[PDB]
UniProtKB/Swiss-Prot annotation, chain A:
Pfam families: Ribosomal_L34. InterPro entries: Ribosomal_bL34 (IPR000271), Ribosomal_bL34_CS (IPR020939). Belongs to the bacterial ribosomal protein bL34 family. The lineage of its organism: Bacteria, Pseudomonadati, Pseudomonadota, Gammaproteobacteria, Enterobacterales. GO terms for biological process: translation. The keyword ATP-binding does not apply. This is Large ribosomal subunit protein bL34. The keyword Ribosomal protein applies. One of its GO terms (cellular component) is ribosome. Gene3D superfamilies: 1.10.287.3980. Coiled coil: none annotated. PROSITE patterns: RIBOSOMAL_L34. Keywords: Ribonucleoprotein, Ribosomal protein.
Swiss-Prot record, chain B:
The keyword Transmembrane helix does not apply. Residues 27-52, 220-271 are annotated as: Disordered. It comes from Escherichia coli (strain K12). One of its GO terms (biological process) is cytoplasmic translation. Keywords: Acetylation, Ribonucleoprotein, Ribosomal protein, RNA-binding, rRNA-binding. Belongs to the universal ribosomal protein uL2 family. The lineage of its organism: Bacteria, Pseudomonadati, Pseudomonadota, Gammaproteobacteria, Enterobacterales. This protein can be partially replaced in vivo by its H.marismortui (HmaL2) or human (L8, from the 60S cytoplasmic ribosome) homolog. It comes from the Bacteria. The keyword DNA-binding does not apply. GO terms for molecular function: RNA binding; rRNA binding; structural constituent of ribosome; transferase activity; zinc ion binding. This is Large ribosomal subunit protein uL2. Changing residue 229 to Q: Loss of peptidyltransferase activity in reconstituted ribosomes. No change in rRNA binding or assembly into ribosomes. InterPro entries: NA-bd_OB-fold (IPR012340), Rib_uL2_dom2 (IPR014722), Ribosomal_uL2 (IPR002171), Ribosomal_uL2_bac/org-type (IPR005880), Ribosomal_uL2_C (IPR022669), Ribosomal_uL2_CS (IPR022671), Ribosomal_uL2_dom3 (IPR014726), Ribosomal_uL2_RNA-bd_dom (IPR022666). Part of the 50S ribosomal subunit. Forms a bridge to the 30S subunit in the 70S ribosome, contacting the 16S rRNA. Interacts weakly with S6 in one of the 3.5 A resolved structures. In pull-down experiments interacts with CedA.
Length: 46, 271, 94
RNA sequence: AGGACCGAACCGACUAAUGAAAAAUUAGCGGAUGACUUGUGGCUGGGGGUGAAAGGCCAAUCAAACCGGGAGAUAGCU
RNA sequence: GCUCGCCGGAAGACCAAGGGUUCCUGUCCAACGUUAAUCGGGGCAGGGUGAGUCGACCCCUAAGGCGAGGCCGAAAGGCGUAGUCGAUGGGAAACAGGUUAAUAUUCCUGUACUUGGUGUUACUGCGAAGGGGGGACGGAGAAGGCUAUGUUGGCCGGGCGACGGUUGUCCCGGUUUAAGCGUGUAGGCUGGUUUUCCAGGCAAAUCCGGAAAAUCAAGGCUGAGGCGUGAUGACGAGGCACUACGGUGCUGAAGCAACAAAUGCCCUGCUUCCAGGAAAAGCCUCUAAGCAUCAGGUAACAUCAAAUCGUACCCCAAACCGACACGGUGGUCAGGUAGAGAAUACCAAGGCGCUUGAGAGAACUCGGGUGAAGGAACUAGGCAAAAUGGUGCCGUAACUUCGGGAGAAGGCACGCUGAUAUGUAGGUGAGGUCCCUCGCGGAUGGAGCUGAAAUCAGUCGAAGAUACCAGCUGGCUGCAACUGUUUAUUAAAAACACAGCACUGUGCAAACACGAAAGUGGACGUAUACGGUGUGACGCCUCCCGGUGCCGGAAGGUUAAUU
């Protein structure tokens, strides 16, 4: 059965990666929040 | 000519082709072509703005000349061509100076026919001249509304406009709708009827044909649930409401012209 | 023209292994560990100056670091660049 | 020629009996040059999308997704 | 190790995606592995991924994204021009053999190619953000020419049979060889060459386009395959020396022909159809500003250059998505016998026996087999099973929109052997002989090779479409015309859609829709068009305006802000 997650690296990056996040204000905010939290992996970026 | 297809399958039974042999069997004039990608009836916001558009065959855009400005140079008609972008047929013409253009093919036109734009040009089919120069009572097509703009009225397969009157700086056109309309007399117009007049006799004959013409299916409001359309819901087949668009506006009869800027030009509305 | 200083920095070590040995013996090709940033030309230059030996050609590759586990904690070894440097016929290297 | 016919791949899911499986199995079954199917990428965002329309589908979630917040909502009820 | 069994259009081989060391070697067996484990995709250590020509990067663009200014918007921000990004598409170049425990079009061996500079001598119009060409394109169909590949014969090497026969019309194996360079064929496209002029191609153009005129019927472009060379080489069945029983080193025969033949190539072709079928660069060409006897261009030749990143391994799976060593997953390769076939059966190459076994042979459950007599009596219902099942030929009703219905129904023939005919009809096609504008040419010729289908005669069996495979049929009737679509996961239908029909709106800055707006879709469309609504092929058809809507009217009554 075709399950929901069907990985594709480029797609992932474009969607969720650092640059995408940077591009918008909300993305930036998210990043900031993550930083505040103390996340080790700030984004999906490898 | 129209051709009723033999019923060798259902979905072919009710098909009627409109088969013109005089069209060019060949690749079109490639310099006048350009790309034309499909919308899916969706705007820049990405939302569907006009339902039921989608798919259909890839099509190039033939760059048709509706402005028709080669004044004084006589052109000769090379060939008639199928245009997928319109109900009419187009005609590749060749000016004496070596330029080619596509034009709407008018009714009588065929390969070898000479045509001409300009004030001086002969009042014959396919020739183009300002409506002050065109005799009253004549049938014209590809009619400009603003001088210099390009033909906007009567472009469709078997349409034409009657010049009913010329009163000073304006002329009154009897448009195909039945609307009588004032138009500046310096606006250009092509003599005769536009070509492909048996276009309306064609019958698609199956669902697939429609699809091929980029038309997705249309669901009836009454078949929906109330959350979707005003007509929706009802156990079994109900419909106890005045017909309306998907956005609640009356559909059987309610007029929607709001343009107060061009009310002056409309001599009489259609009926 | 590569700088002397740069050249010195380029070459990290000789690589000892069976394959390397074989290369040395049969094909006259030495297997070096080099700086990850070191391009082929630079490597060649280094070889020529620092080992005093004519170079035919340099093939490089990047070796990826193995992931290991020291007790409970996971940790990755570093990536590093390997270079097969083929010396010209008759060139004997100390 | 054909939204033509019989039929593998491929797409589906009418009948049947039966956790390996949070919808499968085996045996049969429908379509199979088309309104077909499929890979890659793209676009449409929550009273919003998309919908050959079943209130279907929108990350195992849908008569209004998920995450966080107002928030210790309110609970004549247990 | 020897048997046995299973897959073989896969359960084999090679990739993409995704994973990220799972690869190979040594070593260890606590845990992990549904048991044991000496084994492992487990633990620990070490090793392993080699590129000018494969892929990325790179040049070019599609959908789309971002977007200087700009337009718009309380703010945030939205849209968008110039531009700049974006492959899933276009763009230079490599093949064969050998090798590692583990890499190879990457190493080695041989033999190649490419496009850049730099320098040269030789020549002499070069030059783009511009012009033109080209690139550059659909579906279906039909062949014909080919090859991959296979079969048989020849050849070469080996064999003479654990049991009757087996020196022959006998048995086993092999019989392979690339890119490149040269040739330019089957075949496809197009008339060429020169001269003159011209409101066209944002300017110019010797280019393209258009007009004339002259003269020659062959000119050019394209093109699989073959042949030649590449190759006195490589590979080569197996023999022979050493042996850490893993292998290593030497050696090496023949290496042809015919027939059959793709869904691959010629073919981005041809024919045909309507639904009318990307873009931009590379590439070719034209000039402008310019420079002017300099640069630049093409000419060969020399030299230098091609960086960087990926390359292990899994990849229909025990390594990816499914919590698991548990269904899903795009592309490429496609041997034999039978067969229409990529179906099916048995096999090859290759890969596996599915990580608990051993007994026993109760009830009951699951999955199968057979069944006296009866044959739907079962049951809500013939549910399920049983049956039908192929090719050819004969034959086939109502009704019909004249296509259908129809594979209607129903029947007959079917193996093997011989003969017709030591193998026919056909297919292919070598020598020889003749012609010739000379070649991959044309004629004639028929050797050899291959080879159905039929008829007649015999013959075996209970049974010849013998297995696997493979329609059940007919009669009346509701609904929906039809093919389609639908509740992912209890509903596939009579529901939705549909061609068709009707009403209605909409004159273009269209109606309408998404947007505080700018704008965008509608549409680069223009009433034979577009939107909405209902109905739903085809046929025969299809009173009430009082109520509620809509349309038109505006005499009077009533009536807002305002005053």
């Amino acid at each position: 059965m075709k399950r929901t997650f069907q990985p594709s690296v480029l797609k992932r990056n474009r969607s969720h990666g650092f640059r995408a996040r940077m591009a918008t204000k909300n993305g930036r905010q998210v990043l900031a929040r993550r930083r505040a939290k103390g996340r080790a992996r700030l984004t999906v970026s490898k | 000519a129209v051709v009723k297809c033999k019923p060798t399958s259902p979905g072919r039974r009710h098909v009627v082709k409109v088969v013109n042999p005089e069209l060019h069997k060949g690749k079109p004039f490639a310099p006048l072509l350009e790309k034309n990608s499909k919308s899916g009836g969706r705007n820049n916001n990405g939302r569907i703005t006009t339902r039921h558009i989608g798919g259909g065959h890839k099509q190039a855009y033939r760059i048709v000349d509706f402005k028709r400005n080669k004044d004084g140079i006589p052109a000769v008609v090379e060939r008639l061509e199928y245009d997928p972008n319109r109900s009419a047929n187009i005609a590749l013409v060749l000016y004496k100076d070596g330029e080619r253009r596509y034009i709407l093919a008018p009714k009588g036109l065929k390969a070898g026919d000479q045509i001409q734009s300009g004030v001086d040009a002969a009042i014959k089919p396919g020739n183009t001249l300002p409506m002050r120069n065109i005799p009253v009572g004549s049938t014209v097509h590809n009619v400009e509304m603003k001088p210099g703009k390009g033909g906007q009225l009567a472009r469709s397969a078997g349409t034409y406009v009657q010049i009913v009157a010329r009163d000073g700086a304006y002329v009154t056109l009897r448009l195909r709708s039945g609307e009588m309309r004032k138009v500046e007399a310096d606006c250009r117009a092509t003599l005769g009827e536009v070509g492909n007049a048996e276009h309306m006799l064609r019958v698609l004959g199956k669902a697939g044909a429609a699809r091929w013409r980029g038309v997705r299916p249309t669901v009836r409001g009454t078949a929906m649930n109330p959350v979707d359309h005003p007509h929706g819901g009802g156990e079994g087949r109900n419909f106890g409401k005045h017909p309306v668009t998907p956005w609640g506006v009356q559909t059987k009869g309610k007029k929607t012209r709001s343009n107060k800027r061009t009310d002056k030009f409309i001599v009489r509305r259609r009926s | 023209m590569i700088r002397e200083e740069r050249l010195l920095k380029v070459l990290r070590a000789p690589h000892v292994s069976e394959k390397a040995s074989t290369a040395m013996e049969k094909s006259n090709t030495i297997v070096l560990k080099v700086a990850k940033d070191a391009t082929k030309a630079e490597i060649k230059a280094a070889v020529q100056k620092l080992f005093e030996v004519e170079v035919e050609v340099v093939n490089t590759l990047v070796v990826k670091g193995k992931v290991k586990r020291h007790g409970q904690r996971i940790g990755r070894r570093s990536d590093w660049k390997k270079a097969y440097v083929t010396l010209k016929e008759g060139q004997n290297l100390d």
